Amino acid sequence: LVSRAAIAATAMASLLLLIKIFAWWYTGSVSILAALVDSLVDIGASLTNLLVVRYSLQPADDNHSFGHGKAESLAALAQSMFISGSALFLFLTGIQHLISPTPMTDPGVGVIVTIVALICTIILVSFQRWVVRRTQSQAVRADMLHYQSDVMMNGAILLALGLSWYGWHRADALFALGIGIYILYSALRMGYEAVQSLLDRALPDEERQEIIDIVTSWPGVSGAHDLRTRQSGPTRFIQIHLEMEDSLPLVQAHMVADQVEQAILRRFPGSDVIIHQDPCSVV
Amino acid sequence: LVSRAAIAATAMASLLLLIKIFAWWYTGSVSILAALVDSLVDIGASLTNLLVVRYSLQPADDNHSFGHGKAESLAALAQSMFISGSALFLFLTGIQHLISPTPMTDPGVGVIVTIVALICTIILVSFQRWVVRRTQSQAVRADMLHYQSDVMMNGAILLALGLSWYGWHRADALFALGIGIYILYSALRMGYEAVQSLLDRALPDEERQEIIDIVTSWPGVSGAHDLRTRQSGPTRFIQIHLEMEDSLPLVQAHMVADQVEQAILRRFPGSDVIIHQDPCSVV
Numbered sequence: 222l223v224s225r226a227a228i229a230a231t232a233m234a235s236l237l238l239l240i241k242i243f244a245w246w247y248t249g250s251v252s253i254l255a256a257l258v259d260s261l262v263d264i265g266a267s268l269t270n271l272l273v274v275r276y277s278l279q280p281a282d283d284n285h286s287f288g289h290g291k292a293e294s295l296a297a298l299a300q301s302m303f304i305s306g307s308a309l310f311l312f313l314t315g316i317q318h319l320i321s322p323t324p325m326t327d328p329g330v331g332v333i334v335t336i337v338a339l340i341c342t343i344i345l346v347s348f349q350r351w352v353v354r355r356t357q358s359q360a361v362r363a364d365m366l367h368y369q370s371d372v373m374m375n376g377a378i379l380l381a382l383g384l385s386w387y388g389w390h391r392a393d394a395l396f397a398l399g400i401g402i403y404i405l406y407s408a409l410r411m412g413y414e415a416v417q418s419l420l421d422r423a424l425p426d427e428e429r430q431e432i433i434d435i436v437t438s439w440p441g442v443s444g445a446h447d448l449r450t451r452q453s454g455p456t457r458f459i460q461i462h463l464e465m466e467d468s469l470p471l472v473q474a475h476m477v478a479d480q481v482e483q484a485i486l487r488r489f490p491g492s493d494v495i496i497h498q499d500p501c502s503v504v
Numbered sequence: 505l506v507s508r509a510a511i512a513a514t515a516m517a518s519l520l521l522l523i524k525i526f527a528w529w530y531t532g533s534v535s536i537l538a539a540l541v542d543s544l545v546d547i548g549a550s551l552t553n554l555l556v557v558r559y560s561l562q563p564a565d566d567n568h569s570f571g572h573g574k575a576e577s578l579a580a581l582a583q584s585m586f587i588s589g590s591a592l593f594l595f596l597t598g599i600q601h602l603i604s605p606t607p608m609t610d611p612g613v614g615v616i617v618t619i620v621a622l623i624c625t626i627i628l629v630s631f632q633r634w635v636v637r638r639t640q641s642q643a644v645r646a647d648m649l650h651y652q653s654d655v656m657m658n659g660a661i662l663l664a665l666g667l668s669w670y671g672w673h674r675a676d677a678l679f680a681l682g683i684g685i686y687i688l689y690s691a692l693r694m695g696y697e698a699v700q701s702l703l704d705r706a707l708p709d710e711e712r713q714e715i716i717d718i719v720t721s722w723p724g725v726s727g728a729h730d731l732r733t734r735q736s737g738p739t740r741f742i743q744i745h746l747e748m749e750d751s752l753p754l755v756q757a758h759m760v761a762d763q764v765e766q767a768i769l770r771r772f773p774g775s776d777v778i779i780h781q782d783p784c785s786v787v
């Protein structure tokens with residue numbers, strides 16, 4: 222078990238595609254296609270992304286007294302718009318050459334690029350999927366989503382069965398349109414979750430209940446009333462009002478409260494809680 | 505003195521430009537220019553903006569246990585990108601027809617549109633400026649910025665002095681480029697403040713000091729230690745640890761803490777504070 226610098230590591234893993242920009246060729250073979258710029262965009266985009274996460278990981282600042290966490294959700298929302306753009310672009314291209322011009326990508330150009338493209342993008346996407354699973358990173362999930370579209374690469378266009386015996390036409394249209402609807406949807410949902418962490422949305426009901434249970438069960442407390450929750454990137458923010466006994470000394474009240482705090486802090490490691498203690502002046 | 509529904513009001517004041525879409529003409533005079541679509545975009549854009557602020561104004565939710573405030577800063581950041589786009593578009597157009605083609609907007613077409621355009625946009629921008637001043641609205645400031653670019657309308661192109669006596673050329677280039685640099689800068693700064701409220705950035709040093717003064721001055725408190733601050737839209741979030749005397753009854757400690765809270769609350773109305781009280785277990 223390493224730490225959230227696991228996400229730091231994926232960010233360069235995106236810059237693995239640095240070798241893919243070199244696994245392009247002009248001096249090796251004087252021929253040019255378009256997927257040398259998509260992967261030049263990638264270097265920039267996901268290099269920015271590395272910088273943004275590196276900002277995201279900084280601890281409490283002078284003028285960021287809470288996290289820098291949100292940087293991730295911004296970075297997400299940024300990417301989700303750009304990925305949501307490329308996907309409408311490719312869905313409208315899906316109905317565009319629904320053989321309105323014609324299946325034109327016929328040049329059997331050295332497809333050893335697009336098969337290698339798959340193979341090293343496949344490699345990335347899974348390392349990415351591994352970190353997404355290990356650490357819930359908003360930021361890396363978005364950067365993955367794009368590469369998940371790049372994995373939608375078609376050196377899987379039929380050449381023997383090919384198109385289809387004329388009358389019932391076939392081209393990229395069915396696939397290039399299909400990916401478009403799914404990835405638009407996928408980026409759209411992705412973004413919606415980003416803005417939703419940017420609004421200070423509450424924790425999942427599950428986590429919320431755990432907190433309620435931890436608290437109400439506890440020896441010292443009698444009631445607990447105001448419970449607000451949110452997370453910025455990894456770290457989650459929890460506040461609550463605990464209702465201890467009116468006549469308790471403060472040092473004692475603070476003890477029960479410190480414990481309840483300390484409990485919540487074991488259960489959601491990384492978290493930041495703050496307990497207001499009330500006596501009995503609540504109906 | 506009305507309330508933050510003052511911003512609600514500007515949102516329709518943007519939809520005042522609904523009459524400007526009708527103050528266009530095809531059936532009155534069969535002639536067409538481009539500034540009928542810029543103001544059709546306006547209806548949509550700033551209508552969305554009205555909805556987003558109206559969302560922004562909702563009180564504490566089930567799954568937004570803090571504000572909906574941030575909606576504004578999102579809405580800002582949204583607009584700042586789109587306004588930051590139109591401004592690079594117009595700066596690159598500024599060096600584009602630096603008489604590379606030629607001063608082509610020669611048709612003395614019924615400019616009674618662009619003068620009226622000024623006059624009712626001028627009207628808006630000032631009502632907008634009035635609310636921006638009255639209520640610091642992130643959201644309305646952005647929506648204003650665009651109209652501030654629309655106020656940069658040139659029925660102030662010289663026709664008598666005109667261009668200039670040939671050898672020392674003159675066109676829109678000097679103005680259309682000039683606006684471009686300023687508004688790009690203006691939208692870029694605008695956005696940066698948006699993301700900066702989206703990161704949970706601290707209150708201005710001034711406001712932060714007022715809180716420190718309010719607290720440390722207070723009778724009951726001995727020290728105060730952890731102070732975190734931020735605002736989402738209008739409402740500002742404040743938390744602090746107060747150090748009361750170890751042996752105090754809770755009901756008493758809560759009283760001093762309640763007053764300190766109540767003080768901060770008078771000084772920054774709308775605010776939301778939360779006080780953790782500690783005894784003496786701090787060095």
Ligand SMILES: [Hg+2]
Nearest residue numbers: 340341342344
């Ligand atoms: Hg590889």
Ligand SMILES: [Hg+2]
Nearest residue numbers: 443465466501
């Ligand atoms: Hg009690």
Ligand SMILES: [Hg+2]
Nearest residue numbers: 523623624627
């Ligand atoms: Hg008007």
Ligand SMILES: [Hg+2]
Nearest residue numbers: 726748749784
């Ligand atoms: Hg003390």
Ligand SMILES: [Zn+2]
Nearest residue numbers: 259260263371
């Ligand atoms: Zn790519």
Ligand SMILES: [Zn+2]
Nearest residue numbers: 282283284285
């Ligand atoms: Zn900082």
Ligand SMILES: [Zn+2]
Nearest residue numbers: 446447462499
């Ligand atoms: Zn309470």
Ligand SMILES: [Zn+2]
Nearest residue numbers: 497498499758
């Ligand atoms: Zn209280």
Ligand SMILES: [Zn+2]
Nearest residue numbers: 542543546654
């Ligand atoms: Zn406009």
Ligand SMILES: [Zn+2]
Nearest residue numbers: 565566567568
């Ligand atoms: Zn809500």
Ligand SMILES: [Zn+2]
Nearest residue numbers: 729730745782
């Ligand atoms: Zn403390």
Ligand SMILES: [Zn+2]
Nearest residue numbers: 475479781782
């Ligand atoms: Zn404490």
